[PDB]
Amino acid sequence: GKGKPRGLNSARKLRVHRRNNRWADQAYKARLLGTAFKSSPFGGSSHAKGIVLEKIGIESKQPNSAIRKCVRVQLIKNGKKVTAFVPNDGCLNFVDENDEVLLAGFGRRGKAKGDIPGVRFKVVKVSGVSLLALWKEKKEKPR
Amino acid sequence: ARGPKKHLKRLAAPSHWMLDKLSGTYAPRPSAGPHKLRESLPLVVFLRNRLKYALNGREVKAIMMQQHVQVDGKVRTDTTYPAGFMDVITLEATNEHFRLVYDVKGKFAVHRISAEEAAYKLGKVKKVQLGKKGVPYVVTHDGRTIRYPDPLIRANDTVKIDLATGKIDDFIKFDTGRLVMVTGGRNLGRVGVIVHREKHEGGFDLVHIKDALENTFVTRLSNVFVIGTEAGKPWVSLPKGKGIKLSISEERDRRRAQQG
Amino acid sequence: GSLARAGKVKSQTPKVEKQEKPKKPQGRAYMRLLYTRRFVNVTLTNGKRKMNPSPA
Amino acid sequence: PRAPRTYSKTYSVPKRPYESARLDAELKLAGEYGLKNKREIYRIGFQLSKIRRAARDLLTRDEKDPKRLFEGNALIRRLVRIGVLSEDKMKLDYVLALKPEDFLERRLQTQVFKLGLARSIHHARVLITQRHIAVGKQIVNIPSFTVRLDSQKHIDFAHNSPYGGGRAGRVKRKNQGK
Amino acid sequence: DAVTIRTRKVISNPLLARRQFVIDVLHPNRANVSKDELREKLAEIYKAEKDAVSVFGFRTQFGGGKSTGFGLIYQSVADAKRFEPAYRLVRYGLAEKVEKASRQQRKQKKNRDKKIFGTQRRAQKRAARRNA
RNA sequence: AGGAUAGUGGCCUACCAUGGUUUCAACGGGUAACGGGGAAUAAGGGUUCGAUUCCGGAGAGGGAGCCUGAGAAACGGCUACCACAUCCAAGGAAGGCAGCAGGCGCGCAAAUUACCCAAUCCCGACACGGGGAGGUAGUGACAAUAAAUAACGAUACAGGUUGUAAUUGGAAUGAGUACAAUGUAAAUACCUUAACGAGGAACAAUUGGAGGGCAAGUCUGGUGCCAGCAGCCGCGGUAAUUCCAGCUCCAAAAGCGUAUAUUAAAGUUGUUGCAGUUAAAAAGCUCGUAGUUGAACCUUGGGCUUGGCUGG
């Protein structure tokens, strides 16, 4: 009989069984445990500002061979230190030590993207100016 | 919370006033008076939204402060005075007399009446009991207290108030075959005769009413108002439509024929 | 890894100015332009239809 | 505060953005009727999708049902009134058979061109937008204005338009005035 | 150029000693008709005093050539001055715009007077004695 | 039984019994929890959200206690303590923006220290006063609606009677500006409307892409496992369809991309509707209480009369 109760008065057994078994779903488990609130560097936010500690080059994973140019950022809201990628050919020169950078994820929702090891965030703005605007010479860095 | 409310939000006003959503934040809060807040019609709504004599709330107050508006034969200057079912509104400057009777669509019809009929009103007897010094009295649906009533009058009966002396002319006993208008619920405004009264001790008595088109509906006894001694003999003029509910298809057919 | 080569290729890419060209029509006119270009004067190569044929 | 004012979207985008069959059909349909963009095609499909949904719900009800008879006749009457549904197809089964080209036929832009007031469908839109076309005695400058059957005979140039008996326009007055 | 005025939804309102109606104005080859000119025209049509006629709330239809508003005709100029809003009488020149301080100044003066108990003359007399 | 209360009541007191809740989940803990009307998405069933235009509750820095009053345990009332914090002549005195506007801080994250009681309504001894309640304007790409950025001829050619590709014309119009009138409490704006207002009509549409998924290049130059791209698969080591650019093209367009959450896709939470020999997963095996679920059987058939609605 398909291994689940079918009786008309077995709603409690069906309701409790589903409730027990949704904990095997990591999307459901992460939402109720509040893991983003407790464990995520951003604390559940989409973006987070921070201060650039140092510019660091990270070697890509095999089979790729390149130096992915990231930065070490200490988040203002909680003091946590994360590594953030600086996209676009030569945008590392727009980012200096002790600058305020706005970060965002890679879109893989907490996982590393591509061949870049251990990096889960990217730089969106530096010194309040869009990194894309700086790259296309639409704006100049205020310094 | 700490005391009585004095405001009425526009969205929370009774729907039968037919107020528009966007004209403002508030609606006229009816004053305390003979009729309940939810089952009343403030004179500001009647004089501005219904008759359109006044263009705004400032003007309706100007109208009433000149002593023009009378409710039940007495001058009222309260713009939010809670006029209700069977009340008579007199504007002798325009030589007009209105009675607030529900139409079949659930709203208070603009029902003009003659001066002779504007000299009385009907009231549903809510309770009969003895006052101080052992004097019996009757409480009607509009909060009136009439002393020394006819000893045959009981609750759910209808009395005819002289409305100038406040006395009782005569009454109608609540019984099978009496003409009735429904004053509450989704059958509000319908007119029919009592077919059978079904009693429920400790609960709500139900009345079975048959329409003039032999449609039968059931409603609570508290929503039943006796208005006539038999079918086709009401003690007041009924509004246009005679309290007969038509289906939406019938109304659509009637409107097509009326307009060609 | 060394950070000295950041922006190497973009810096040494020879600068080429955009050739000045007439504006293309906007809005309803552009849909009109695309519609004729694809359904009125059809440029199919006997069943071979290409949006951007490279010169060959 | 004041009661909120209702608003709603009047279109919906396709689930698959890139599909040559749908892309070609839309562009072919926009070119025929001189539409500005794909949203004007999404709008017709959206409002036609909900006409069908209403008709489908009534068609699941039993015949002679009061709601099916009342709302079904009303829905048929509205579609017949704007000329989308033919007078011999008042059955609520032909409502499901309607197509987006039926609605685009009834636009003001389409009717101006098909009445000979414009050289092409693209000439029709600019005539409408430039306040030259009047329906009845009222100037309409909305190309998507859906022409009713009783309004069909009263589409003409505005009485104060240069093409309809008004004075000469800005350009002519500057030229003949020099 | 041949201004035509139509009145509809006319209601006789002796409660406010006036007649009230909706005004339709046909003004082809004309931007619109000024309120002052409509009051003159309405007074002639109904043989009333110009100062007893009030019009307001006009809007021109899309495409022009027609406007719609609201109009009042009182039984007398005295009745108009009694029931008309003040701002409309200022529009018609039948009254003078009352001159008062700005809303900020009136409120600030009111709150300054809340700090004085008794007459102002006593308060300033006492202040002079204190500072002398 | 009393006391207290506006009044019922372990609400409190005295005396007396030993009761009351709980695997149908009590009690405790968590909540990045005010509840609901509702919102998003949705074939159906569902999943997620609801501080926030309405209703109910609670609070006015944190507690507690009260006065007045019909009504408050009120905070634009008082009293005290705690924490902040203002003036001081050092003796003292005065505080409470989770009202409106505004400032600091916090941060990814949010507007004017503007005008008015004209409307909606409320309050008062009141036709007259007051109302940052409310309305009006300012900022406002939160979302939503409609909707410009061109149209039509002639030549010249190509072309299959007419669709274009170019260089040649005369028309049309609102974006904008403005007399004015309207609008309004007064304005602004809209709507109307004199005069002005379009050829590169420079009055110049953008945002992302062009290996696949996925629509659109095997074009040209640059670099050479570097720089970089790339949601994923992958591209880049000297002819790179993927990087940096030019050209061309594609998609959506006054909008387009990115991040995060959520919904569908997900029959990958499965009641509808999953899987368990070998892919993850039948307890080592029996007993067993709650739970769930439990064979069949008791007025059936027949007859007569009649009302209505479907087809004719």
Side-chain angles (χ1 to χ4, degrees):
Chain A
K2 263 179 181 172
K4 51 182 157 187
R6 277 209 195 106
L8 199 64
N9 294 343
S10 63
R12 173 177 287 111
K13 182 67 180 294
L14 291 173
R15 175 174 47 90
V16 168
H17 187 251
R18 175 61 47 236
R19 178 218 290 162
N20 288 331
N21 280 270
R22 294 182 68 188
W23 287 107
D25 185 332
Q26 45 175 267
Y28 169 87
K29 183 164 213 176
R31 170 156 43 85
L32 281 72
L33 294 192
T35 61
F37 201 71
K38 317 281 194 55
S39 296
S40 184
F42 278 15
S45 304
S46 53
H47 297 65
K49 278 177 197 175
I51 304 298
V52 176
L53 298 179
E54 58 175 311
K55 294 188 286 185
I56 173 177
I58 297 169
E59 293 179 353
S60 60
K61 282 190 256 181
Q62 284 329 299
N64 284 0
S65 175
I67 297 298
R68 304 294 168 219
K69 294 181 177 66
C70 313
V71 286
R72 288 293 295 184
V73 182
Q74 185 167 38
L75 297 183
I76 297 168
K77 71 196 293 182
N78 47 20
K80 294 180 177 176
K81 285 167 194 167
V82 303
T83 313
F85 187 60
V86 188
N88 291 334
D89 208 328
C91 292
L92 188 62
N93 306 326
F94 293 125
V95 181
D96 292 331
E97 271 91 347
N98 312 306
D99 290 332
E100 184 178 1
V101 285
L102 177 74
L103 310 186
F106 284 163
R108 289 207 73 204
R109 302 174 302 101
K111 313 182 219 78
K113 154 185 165 308
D115 53 27
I116 300 169
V119 174
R120 318 185 264 166
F121 313 98
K122 72 179 169 185
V123 167
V124 173
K125 293 163 72 166
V126 64
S127 293
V129 173
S130 166
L131 209 55
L132 200 71
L134 292 177
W135 197 56
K136 304 163 103 81
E137 291 84 4
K138 285 169 166 287
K139 296 191 181 55
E140 293 83 3
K141 197 173 158 180
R143 190 74 268 158
Chain B
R2 296 173 46 214
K5 290 194 170 336
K6 293 152 167 191
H7 290 70
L8 187 57
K9 297 272 182 64
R10 178 64 63 86
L11 278 191
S15 73
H16 66 90
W17 296 354
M18 295 183 287
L19 295 184
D20 55 332
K21 309 193 310 187
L22 304 185
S23 177
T25 289
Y26 303 103
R29 191 183 176 85
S31 308
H35 299 275
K36 286 179 158 298
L37 189 145
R38 202 64 49 174
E39 317 161 9
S40 77
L41 185 71
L43 293 175
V44 62
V45 177
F46 185 70
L47 284 174
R48 176 194 57 188
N49 304 63
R50 287 309 189 280
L51 299 186
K52 294 180 176 66
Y53 277 140
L55 297 179
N56 61 7
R58 206 205 59 242
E59 270 175 18
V60 64
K61 184 175 175 66
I63 291 172
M64 294 178 70
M65 283 303 319
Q66 309 173 71
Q67 299 297 289
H68 292 106
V69 183
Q70 299 179 242
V71 185
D72 288 342
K74 296 192 191 169
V75 170
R76 301 299 174 195
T77 64
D78 188 18
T79 72
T80 53
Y81 182 89
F85 189 58
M86 284 282 159
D87 281 12
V88 175
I89 299 184
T90 300
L91 311 158
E92 44 196 19
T94 69
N95 194 21
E96 290 171 317
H97 307 260
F98 306 87
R99 176 164 267 130
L100 281 72
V101 286
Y102 293 118
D103 60 67
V104 67
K105 268 299 160 45
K107 277 75 70 177
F108 271 124
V110 180
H111 182 46
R112 298 151 188 280
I113 64 181
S114 62
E116 305 90 48
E117 192 202 328
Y120 67 88
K121 87 176 286 181
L122 279 70
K124 170 173 174 181
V125 176
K126 306 302 286 183
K127 56 175 60 177
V128 181
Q129 65 183 177
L130 263 70
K132 282 317 189 290
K133 285 161 155 44
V135 172
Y137 65 92
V138 173
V139 185
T140 69
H141 77 296
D142 50 347
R144 278 174 194 266
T145 291
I146 297 90
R147 305 219 301 173
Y148 298 119
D150 202 301
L152 283 185
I153 296 182
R154 291 293 176 274
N156 303 308
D157 297 340
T158 299
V159 294
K160 173 169 174 190
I161 310 299
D162 181 41
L163 185 63
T165 67
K167 302 315 209 313
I168 293 176
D169 299 349
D170 60 357
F171 61 99
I172 304 166
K173 288 298 302 310
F174 184 95
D175 204 6
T176 302
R178 293 310 202 277
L179 199 51
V180 173
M181 185 180 288
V182 188
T183 60
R186 71 171 269 149
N187 291 296
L188 191 139
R190 300 182 75 171
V191 178
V193 299
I194 299 168
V195 160
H196 158 63
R197 174 187 171 168
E198 159 194 321
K199 300 204 164 199
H200 293 290
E201 305 185 344
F204 311 94
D205 285 16
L206 300 169
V207 180
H208 295 255
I209 304 162
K210 196 171 60 53
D211 207 337
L213 262 52
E214 291 83 4
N215 295 133
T216 313
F217 52 98
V218 190
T219 191
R220 272 182 188 183
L221 179 49
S222 58
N223 296 323
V224 165
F225 197 109
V226 170
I227 72 174
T229 180
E230 73 190 357
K233 291 208 168 304
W235 274 16
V236 293
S237 62
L238 289 189
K240 172 175 50 60
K242 307 308 170 188
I244 300 158
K245 154 163 290 190
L246 311 170
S247 77
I248 53 179
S249 59
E250 295 169 298
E251 296 182 336
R252 177 204 62 211
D253 297 338
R254 198 174 48 79
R255 267 163 210 149
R256 285 196 209 281
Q258 184 178 2
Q259 78 183 358
Chain C
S2 179
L3 295 174
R5 307 186 292 276
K8 162 180 167 303
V9 161
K10 192 190 172 47
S11 78
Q12 65 183 177
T13 302
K15 180 68 173 66
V16 175
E17 295 294 328
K18 293 181 176 67
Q19 291 80 17
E20 183 178 1
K21 65 179 72 66
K23 71 170 182 185
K24 64 179 73 175
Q26 306 286 332
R28 180 206 31 84
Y30 195 65
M31 293 295 172
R32 181 195 203 171
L33 176 66
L34 297 185
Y35 168 73
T36 71
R37 219 165 63 181
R38 293 191 211 169
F39 300 102
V40 175
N41 49 334
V42 296
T43 193
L44 73 165
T45 59
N46 196 355
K48 303 310 184 329
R49 182 176 181 269
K50 298 298 293 295
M51 294 296 173
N52 190 19
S54 67
Chain D
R2 207 204 53 196
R5 193 192 288 266
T6 314
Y7 64 84
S8 66
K9 263 172 72 183
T10 63
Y11 75 102
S12 73
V13 307
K15 299 311 196 310
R16 301 158 163 268
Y18 312 118
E19 197 190 299
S20 292
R22 185 188 48 80
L23 286 176
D24 283 9
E26 286 165 3
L27 181 55
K28 191 162 167 297
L29 185 62
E32 175 175 347
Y33 297 100
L35 307 180
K36 170 176 181 184
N37 61 7
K38 302 297 186 71
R39 193 199 289 122
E40 291 181 321
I41 297 161
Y42 301 159
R43 173 170 59 197
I44 297 301
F46 175 78
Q47 89 182 78
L48 175 58
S49 166
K50 83 172 43 180
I51 282 167
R52 293 178 181 176
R53 171 176 315 125
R56 287 190 281 110
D57 291 331
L58 305 174
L59 279 184
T60 59
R61 293 175 179 276
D62 189 359
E63 182 65 26
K64 301 289 95 175
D65 184 291
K67 182 165 194 172
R68 162 168 180 168
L69 292 179
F70 186 81
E71 301 200 332
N73 290 342
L75 165 69
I76 289 170
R77 182 209 78 103
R78 269 189 283 108
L79 288 168
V80 167
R81 182 197 206 180
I82 58 181
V84 164
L85 190 72
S86 178
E87 281 75 358
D88 61 357
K89 292 177 165 177
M90 308 187 198
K91 298 298 293 295
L92 202 73
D93 291 331
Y94 301 107
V95 170
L96 296 186
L98 287 172
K99 282 178 308 299
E101 309 78 356
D102 302 302
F103 286 83
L104 299 164
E105 276 322 289
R106 305 302 309 162
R107 302 174 88 236
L108 191 48
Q109 190 186 341
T110 301
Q111 289 311 305
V112 174
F113 164 64
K114 286 191 156 26
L115 281 197
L117 303 172
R119 315 274 71 74
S120 66
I121 190 78
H122 304 269
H123 186 216
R125 185 180 295 275
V126 297
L127 275 171
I128 292 173
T129 302
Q130 288 167 354
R131 319 184 73 188
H132 293 296
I133 301 302
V135 187
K137 34 188 179 292
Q138 163 75 68
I139 296 170
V140 181
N141 79 329
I142 304 305
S144 53
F145 175 102
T146 297
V147 186
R148 289 180 187 153
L149 278 191
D150 50 297
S151 297
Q152 183 86 50
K153 311 302 174 182
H154 306 334
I155 304 183
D156 211 313
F157 287 111
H159 64 87
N160 74 314
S161 178
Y163 306 140
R167 66 200 278 246
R170 186 180 70 190
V171 175
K172 177 168 285 185
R173 287 189 331 257
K174 200 190 185 191
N175 289 337
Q176 81 180 344
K178 85 182 174 303
Chain E
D1 170 35
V3 165
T4 296
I5 294 162
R6 314 199 167 128
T7 65
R8 58 183 221 268
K9 297 202 161 209
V10 183
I11 277 176
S12 197
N13 192 19
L15 307 183
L16 288 160
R18 76 187 180 201
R19 193 151 27 86
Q20 64 184 358
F21 43 84
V22 178
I23 292 171
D24 271 321
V25 188
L26 269 76
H27 51 84
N29 291 318
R30 216 172 192 294
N32 44 37
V33 193
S34 79
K35 293 185 287 185
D36 185 74
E37 177 172 358
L38 292 173
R39 286 165 70 228
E40 262 155 25
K41 290 199 164 56
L42 269 174
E44 293 179 354
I45 293 179
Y46 299 100
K47 296 182 290 294
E49 272 285 328
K50 190 212 182 190
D51 282 4
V53 182
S54 185
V55 302
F56 52 91
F58 278 92
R59 179 157 184 86
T60 315
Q61 292 180 356
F62 185 84
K66 187 192 182 60
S67 284
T68 316
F70 203 86
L72 308 168
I73 292 176
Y74 291 84
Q75 315 170 4
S76 66
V77 185
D79 282 306
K81 284 166 172 283
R82 180 154 58 111
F83 298 123
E84 212 60 20
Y87 76 91
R88 293 178 183 175
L89 299 173
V90 183
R91 279 187 204 170
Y92 309 147
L94 306 188
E96 310 308 308
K97 175 56 171 48
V98 65
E99 294 294 328
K100 41 161 81 185
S102 85
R103 203 148 174 282
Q104 297 294 321
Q105 314 291 111
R106 270 143 47 211
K107 291 172 159 195
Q108 279 167 344
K109 177 189 175 187
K110 180 253 296 178
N111 286 348
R112 274 191 312 261
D113 291 331
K114 283 212 293 186
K115 304 182 168 197
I116 294 155
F117 179 82
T119 46
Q120 303 273 345
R121 185 179 67 189
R122 172 190 199 76
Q124 66 204 30
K125 191 259 297 178
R126 285 183 49 97
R129 170 264 315 178
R130 179 71 274 172
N131 290 318

